[PDB]
Swiss-Prot record, chain A:
The active site is at residue 159. Belongs to the short-chain dehydrogenases/reductases (SDR) family. It comes from Homo sapiens (Human). The keyword NADP applies. Keywords: Disease variant, Endoplasmic reticulum, Glycoprotein, Lipid metabolism, Membrane, NADP, Oxidoreductase, Signal-anchor, Steroid metabolism, Transmembrane, Transmembrane helix. This is 11-beta-hydroxysteroid dehydrogenase 1.
Length: 259, 255
């Protein structure tokens, strides 16, 4: 299966956390591919700037809806409003995360709960709401995760917990859809440190390492969802990408596929 | 391992009105440890404490309540500490009731699983850390194969167990760097012979259930030895494949 830019054109896609960083870049890449896009985040203005830019890039359609993913009601309403704005949905890209900084964990349960709600729970709510439209178009769901969602890393405990949660939930669902013959693909993207403006401000001091370009990253995530791959791995270190996979788990799940 | 290690240690066991938690309480009792057990069933906790005294526990008390209530969770540990005069080991074992079903739209079960199976464990840990640091204690987190590998019919449950791994494994990293001498043991359990589990998987999961009595003992031992991870499954193949050598290498390299 070879990826082609043509694959995306009459495709209707949603991109959360697209006002900046990787989400923003994906919006542009999709626009350059001339697809319908509905970007969301909290900041209304910065979102207007990305939409206009998308149209200039050739976006077949570019809209936005501002709101906070801390409120599950907005999460639901968004998928509906975004759906009618483009008359369908063929790909759901969950990319948003709550503001996260690097710190030792002490007693901030508030941040832990907020992380689980925004980084994990809303992805589930968003999925439930978009599944129907996705089943209709045999869509695809792309869940943006991190290396800290596959391995343990100090200073990002709450963040790591939410990303690990995504793997457990969405990987389990993937198996359910397989037997329930549900034609919706789920792509888990495991990313390493990326040169995002937010990432840089929070990384200088703890995560001492090379940061991959956000533009390439955003494209790799998109191509993975298009090829309907179960997982995408993108990091600046080839030695990390070499050890990040876990064949034992794949084998064990095969041996278990024979409930 | 030496049973003398627990000879008179102060231990908290959650979800101990039945199943694995109950067996752990009894093992601790026969070892002469001080034990405080919790769950929602007052009537049942009364019975476990009674048996614990019978088995030879240095001391045994219970405090009933639901871990869906974070305030109760926080206050429970402080009162448990007052009951034994401190704390040496915190065993987080409880989980919200979970049956096997495909995931449709039961957002309630997903959130409740995250709240009870994961968030309450964090609240409990935050409240017990002061006392655990005083005695260079240990935290024992009970998980499952479904917390290391994906499995259908238990999406919400699996999500919460994976979360425990990410959170507690990250904290362990911080503690070694921060000089926090409190061990964290994650227990990866295969199917266990508990009453609720045996009835929940009836006619669905076809695997040999390991004995809860032996399971409870290994969790204790692993906690006493301050082992980062305990793997317990009746199958030799599952025990081997459940490990992640790539992750251990990658992490050692990072640290
Ligand atoms: N950058 C990196 O190094 C890495 C990033 N990742 C993953 O990439 C994805 C994007 O990360 P990145 O581009 O760096 O993040 P950014 O901070 O640059 O962008 C985050 C987006 O989420 C939105 N957002 C924040 N809080 C809320 C709510 N509440 C609702 N939307 C919210 C922001 O908009 P607004 O504030 O206006 O609401 C913004 O558009 C995440 O899922 C992350 O975990 C993974 C590995 C590394
Ligand atoms: N049994 C198995 O096959 C396996 C078990 N495990 C793990 O082992 C641990 C023990 O499981 P198991 O012994 O089978 O479970 P049980 O159902 O036998 O016991 C669960 C305990 O949790 C308590 N509990 C339930 N809801 C709440 C709240 N809300 C508060 N306490 C609550 C119950 O008491 P009460 O109702 O009175 O509140 C009871 O003491 C769990 O962490 C589980 O995920 C892992 C793999 C397999
Ligand atoms: C937390 C933030 C600075 C960045 S860094 C990240 N994930 C990540 C990647 C590499 C190493 C450790 C990590 F945790 N995800 C993010 O959003
Ligand atoms: C969910 C419940 C019936 C039991 S079963 C379990 N873990 C587990 C073990 C083996 C296979 C699938 C699983 F999910 N953990 C539990 O507490």
């Amino acid at each position: 299966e070879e990826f082609r830019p043509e694959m995306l054109q009459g495709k209707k896609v949603i991109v959360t956390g697209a006002s900046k960083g990787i989400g923003r870049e994906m919006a542009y890449h999709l626009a350059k591919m001339g697809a319908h896009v509905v970007v969301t985040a909290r900041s209304k203005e910065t979102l207007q700037k990305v939409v206009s830019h998308c149209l200039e890039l050739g976006a077949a359609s570019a809209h936005y809806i501002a709101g906070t993913m801390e409120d599950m009601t907005f999460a639901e309403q968004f998928v509906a409003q975004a759906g009618k704005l483009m008359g369908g949905l063929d790909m759901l890209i969950l990319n948003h995360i709550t503001n996260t900084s690097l710190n030792l964990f002490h007693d901030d349960i508030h941040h832990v709960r907020k992380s689980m709600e925004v980084n994990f729970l809303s992805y589930v709510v968003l999925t439930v709401a978009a599944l129907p439209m996705l089943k209709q178009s045999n869509g695809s769901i792309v869940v943006v995760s991190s290396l800290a969602g596959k391995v343990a890393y100090p200073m990002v405990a709450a963040y790591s917990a939410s990303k690990f949660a995504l793997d457990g939930f969405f990987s389990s669902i993937r198996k359910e859809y397989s037997v329930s013959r549900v034609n919706v693909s789920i792509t888990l993207c495991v990313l390493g440190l990326i040169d995002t403006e937010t990432a840089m401000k929070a990384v200088s001091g703890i995560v001492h390492m090379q940061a991959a370009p956000k533009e390439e990253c955003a494209l790799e995530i998109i191509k993975g969802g298009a090829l309907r791959q179960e997982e995408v791995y993108y990091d600046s270190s080839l030695w990390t990408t070499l050890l990040i996979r876990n064949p034992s788990r794949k084998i064990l799940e095969f041996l278990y596929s024979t409930y």
